[PDB]
Design an enzyme around this catalytic site. Structure first.
Site, PDB file in Angstrom:
ATOM      1  CB  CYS B  52      -0.907   0.014   1.226  1.00 33.78           C
ATOM      2  SG  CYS B  52      -1.994   1.429   1.275  1.00 33.78           S
ATOM      3  CB  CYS B  54      -1.871   5.795   1.526  1.00 36.49           C
ATOM      4  SG  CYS B  54      -2.098   6.882   0.089  1.00 36.49           S
ATOM      5  CB  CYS B  71      -2.841  -3.438  -3.265  1.00 31.58           C
ATOM      6  SG  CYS B  71      -4.255  -2.794  -4.169  1.00 31.58           S
ATOM      7  CB  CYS B  73      -4.924  -3.648   2.424  1.00 29.12           C
ATOM      8  SG  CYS B  73      -6.421  -2.638   2.589  1.00 29.12           S
ATOM      9  CB  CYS B  82      -9.809   1.354  -0.488  1.00 26.53           C
ATOM     10  SG  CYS B  82      -8.661   2.240  -1.559  1.00 26.53           S
TER      11      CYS B  82
HETATM   12  S1  SF4 Z   1      -6.999  -1.608  -1.273  1.00 20.16           S
HETATM   13 FE1  SF4 Z   1      -6.627   0.631  -1.098  1.00 20.16          FE
HETATM   14  S2  SF4 Z   1      -5.785   0.894   1.006  1.00 20.16           S
HETATM   15 FE2  SF4 Z   1      -5.601  -1.333   0.508  1.00 20.16          FE
HETATM   16  S3  SF4 Z   1      -3.518  -1.554  -0.364  1.00 20.16           S
HETATM   17 FE3  SF4 Z   1      -4.928  -1.233  -2.134  1.00 20.16          FE
HETATM   18  S4  SF4 Z   1      -4.869   1.021  -2.473  1.00 20.16           S
HETATM   19 FE4  SF4 Z   1      -3.998   0.682  -0.392  1.00 20.16          FE
END
Ligand code: SF4
Ligand code: NA
Ligand code: NA
Lengths: 88, 113, 107
Positions: B52, B54, B71, B73, B82
């Site tokens: 991820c 972020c 991802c 996640c 998300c």
């Molecule tokens: S689903 Fe969203 S929060 Fe999870 S790893 Fe992917 S981009 Fe990041």
């Protein structure tokens, strides 16, 4: 490691979900509400092969749910400490 | 520093496919979508998995191994949450109406970045 | 335009911990979308609070030790410091009214 050692003690303990929470990964069950369901902690996934992971839902909890027409489906969902209570 | 176009195109195609399959939509700011996809591509280039982009990690290799933040996640797979605002549920105020993003959209949106 | 000052691991002690008055630190990452969408908002508030609150930006990829020390996990994260101590934490993209209200509490 005093919150990690406290958390490790809870592995295997029985828990019950205390907050409304819907999950979408149970196989061939599109949506499951977990509020009130009971299971047990199978792992504290922050600790992994001697290393530490920054998981925000650290408790992998095993649940079994009865599905009409099919039988008990077993699944895991990760939870936070404030989303469940321990049983006895 | 910049991800290869092979990893960007993989993650672009995954995100289009994961959006329809989860019933989620890209953000009205398609710059967020393109940037996050590129961040997934760069992490896949450097560690072999789309970690991820972020989250801040102490041990990226361990994170890739455990898989929680690869991802999609765990929070997205289990709760459809998300926090990079890549996959948004329709009730989200920032959810658009598109489940597609072309490779041209990513190239013009991320230009001069 | 004068862009928000950068802070790093090397300069954290002198610029943030030893500062006088409130200091706001925006923890961001180059490939985090939600962190780029609040950039105009943080630039807006830096101007609104000039001379009253000092703003810094920290790239968590180039300066990993400070977010590690303060438990910065989700990006973006905004933290407010007074006298070298963490006083507030705002996680994720938030609207201008939420940020104004939290920042107003530090005069
Ligand atoms: S689903 Fe969203 S929060 Fe999870 S790893 Fe992917 S981009 Fe990041
Ligand atoms: Na998106
Ligand atoms: Na310093």
């Amino acid at each position: 490691t005093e919150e990690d050692e406290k958390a490790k003690e809870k592995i295997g303990a029985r828990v019950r979900v205390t907050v409304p929470l819907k999950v979408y990964h149970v196989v061939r069950v599109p949506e499951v509400e977990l509020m009130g369901m009971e299971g047990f902690i199978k792992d504290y996934v922050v600790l992994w092969k001697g290393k530490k992971i920054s998981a925000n839902l650290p408790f992998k909890v095993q649940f079994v749910k009865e599905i009409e027409g099919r039988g008990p489906v077993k699944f895991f969902t990760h939870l936070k400490e404030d989303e469940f209570e321990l049983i006895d | 520093t910049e991800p290869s176009e092979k990893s960007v195109e993989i993650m672009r195609k995954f995100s289009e496919q994961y959006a329809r399959r989860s019933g989620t939509y890209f953000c009205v700011d398609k710059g967020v979508t393109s940037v996050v996809i590129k961040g997934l591509a760069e992490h896949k280039d450097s560690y072999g998995a789309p970690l991820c982009p972020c989250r801040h990690y102490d041990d990226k290799a361990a994170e890739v191994g455990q898989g929680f933040w690869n991802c999609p996640c765990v929070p997205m797979r289990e709760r459809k949450e998300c926090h990079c605002m890549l996959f948004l549920t329709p009730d989200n105020d920032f959810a658009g109406k598109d489940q597609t993003i072309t490779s041209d959209e990513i190239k013009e949106t991320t230009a001069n970045m | 335009t004068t862009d928000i000052q950068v802070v790093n691991d090397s300069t954290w002690d002198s610029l943030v911990l030893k500062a006088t008055g409130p200091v706001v630190v925006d923890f961001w990452a180059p490939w985090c979308g939600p962190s780029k969408m609040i950039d105009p908002l943080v630039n807006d508030l830096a101007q609104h609070y000039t001379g009253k609150i000092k703003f810094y930006k920290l790239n968590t990829d180039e300066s990993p030790n400070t977010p590690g020390q303060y438990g910065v996990r989700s990006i973006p994260t905004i933290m407010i410091f007074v006298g070298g101590e963490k006083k507030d934490t705002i996680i994720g993209a938030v609207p201008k009214t939420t940020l104004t209200s939290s920042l107003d509490k530090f005069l």
